[PDB]
Amino acid sequence: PFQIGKNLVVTPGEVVFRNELIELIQYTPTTEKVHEKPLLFVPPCINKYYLMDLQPDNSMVRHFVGQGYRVFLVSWRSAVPEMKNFTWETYIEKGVFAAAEAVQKITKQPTMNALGFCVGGVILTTALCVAQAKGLKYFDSATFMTSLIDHAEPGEISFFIDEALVASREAKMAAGGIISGKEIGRTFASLRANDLVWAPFDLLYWNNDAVDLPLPMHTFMLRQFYINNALITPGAITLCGVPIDISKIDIPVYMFAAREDHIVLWSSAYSGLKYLSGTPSRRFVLGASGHIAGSINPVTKDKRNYWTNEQLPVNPEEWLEGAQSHPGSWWKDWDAWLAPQSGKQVPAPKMLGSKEFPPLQPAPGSYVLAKAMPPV
Amino acid sequence: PFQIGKNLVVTPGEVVFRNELIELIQYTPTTEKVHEKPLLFVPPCINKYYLMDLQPDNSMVRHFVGQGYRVFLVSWRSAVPEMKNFTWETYIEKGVFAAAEAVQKITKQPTMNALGFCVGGVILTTALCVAQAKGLKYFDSATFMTSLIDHAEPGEISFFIDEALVASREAKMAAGGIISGKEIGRTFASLRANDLVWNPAPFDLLYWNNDAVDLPLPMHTFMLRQFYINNALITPGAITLCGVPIDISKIDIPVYMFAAREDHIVLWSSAYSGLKYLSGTPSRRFVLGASGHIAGSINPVTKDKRNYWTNEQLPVNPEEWLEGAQSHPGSWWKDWDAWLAPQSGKQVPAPKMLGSKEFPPLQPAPGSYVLAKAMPPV
């Protein structure tokens, strides 16, 4: 069967940093030269990251390392009791910022480009606001891959959030707790039959390999984003001492959505763009197909197509009407957008980590191997 | 590994009638006596029927035959070019009514009870209106299993209907056409991630899901326009079928409605919303099953897992219905059986032959139409 790290999730590298929330994976170079400016992947913390690193042929991380990027990836710890009080803020501080700090220390580069996928995109979005407000310059650009900002139309999840249960948890928040992967899967699972082509056993395995979340983080996510749609209203939430205002984000943004995505409706993603009014530029790219088939659409096979349009009208239907279709994988377009923002070519590093951050264990590390807690 | 008719869809019987749209399957009795009044299953047409007849343990058809019902089932023909002009009305006439006429002729019984599942329930609803208006008495009761009547909240499908495409097809309706299984699977999706858990499951369901059908363009276009966009059934006379202005307040037989609590395809409160429009009926029953679209609908008595909820009161607010409901362990099929059986006549000896002299058995169940594969890409 599947053994994570052995016949799945095999892109070579090392865990180079670990804390109470993350392992940071640094991938081994496969090119003689690399773009100097690192690339940080922020996967979701619902399910395991390795949707982005399945087999070599369909691995997103492997592709980008092969394009010369200095790829680092956040591997989230599945919640256990010592994490029962962790909050959304913990994911910003101990997740995104801790990762960014380690990247700066290891590479000696002052900044990086960031990618956030699914809920990792929402965490990244909030992290960007905190960083901007505090003058912390971690990121030179941000990419949001099938992630919401405007949660007004979150899809069918809207019908299945139990507001009374969220309120019950809020009442007892200070005690913390653990939300089971089983519970999370009833609302946040993202696999559909049409993603299985026709290993589609890889995807079936991934879908069932669930992870747990801290109660405070999860309850806040439901209340503030899904119910209150807080990000569209400046100052509606406060994180890390900062009133959150998406209009303050001030770096180039790339936003990817998939046309047939039933999990993150493409028009709902598109709706976020108008809120990013402090950015110097925004790029929206629409991939063909469904959530997984469209998102994880590799260049190795280069199937399907994507659409581009540099004009960003308010109406997504107008965007699409003016768009140009291009054959193959949107990864190519993202690469072309990222590369000019990635510095000059330098020799590939000969070692993983650094003296201060020595390699700890081979990729894919220990946190991705955890099994969800037993039923309670 | 899956061979339809051999290790799935194996409830014994015979095709006893065939026309350009349907094969009617009559199932072999497994009881010495049967309820006299037959039971007609009108399955989904957007997918193949055999979600209702998977493995023996989870087969709905097999269970009901084993309870003593004289079960007949409509197996819909996947659309081919000779069907490219078929309409919604065709599904009423060549589907539901043709089946009911054959049942009458084979059994010599004047009426039957009907079950409609998913879009089969919608077709059945419209057929009941036509029959009522024309004084045709085919049905003594109707059961709607995860089917909409009020389409105001149809769920995620709303986001995946392109009105402009519907309109362009309306403009060219006379020419007819075929809507591919691929297109159908991009707008309708019967499965969710919880149905795909893996450690046959989930492969039996994936095979069923991927065993796609095609639909005639006029039927499918009408379905999208009139139900999903216009929500025509809630307005008397908003559509006309078979010469008849459709007014669901005219339906005048007992109704049973099933929905599943965690159903993402047919939201249970959306199903519930239809009940208030069935104002001509002598009785209405709503039953809510635990779990999702597949596991909640096809929840067999053999294992008798999960639960269902009952409440005789029918308030406008579905939350009020649920707050007043009583939970019962196991399968809702038990409840449906208890509702159906008193409406199913006396016990008579099981028929010794399938079909009749006029309707001889044509081939063993599950027949030929179910074995057809979708047309190639174009």
Residue numbers in the entry:
A (entry chain A): 174 to 371, 385 to 562
B (entry chain B): 174 to 372, 384 to 562
Task: Please quote the paper that reports this structure.
PHA synthase (PhaC) is the key enzyme involved in PHA biosynthesis and functions by polymerizing monomeric hydroxyalkanoate substrates. A typical example of a C4 SCL monomer is (R)-3-hydroxybutyrate (3HB), and PhaC polymerizes the acyl moieties of 3-hydroxybutyryl-coenzyme A (3HB-CoA) to the high molecular weight PHA product poly-hydroxybutyrate (PHB). PhaC is generally depicted to form a dimer which is an important form for its functional activity.
The structure of the catalytic domain (residues 175–567), hereafter referred to as PhaCCs-CAT, was determined by a single-wavelength anomalous dispersion (SAD) method and refined to 1.48 Å resolution. PhaCCs-CAT is folded into a globular structure which belongs to the α/β hydrolase super family and comprises α/β core and CAP (hereafter referred to as CAP) subdomains. The CAP subdomain covers a cleft containing the active site residues that comprise the catalytic triad. Cys291 forms the catalytic triad with His477 (located at the N-end of α5 helix) and Asp447 (located at the loop between β8 strand and α4 helix, β8-α4 loop). Our structure comprises a closed form, which has no visible path for substrate access to the active site located inside of the enzyme. We found several clusters of water molecules at the interface between the CAP and α/β core subdomains, suggesting potential mobility of the CAP subdomain, which may undergo a dynamic structural change during the catalytic action of the enzyme. In the PhaCCs-CAT dimer, the CAP subdomains mediate the intermolecular contacts at the dimer interface, although part of the core domains also participate in formation of the interface. Inspection of the PhaCCs-CAT and PhaCCn-CAT structures suggests that the catalytic domain of PHA synthases exists in an open-closed equilibrium in solution by means of conformational changes in the CAP subdomain.
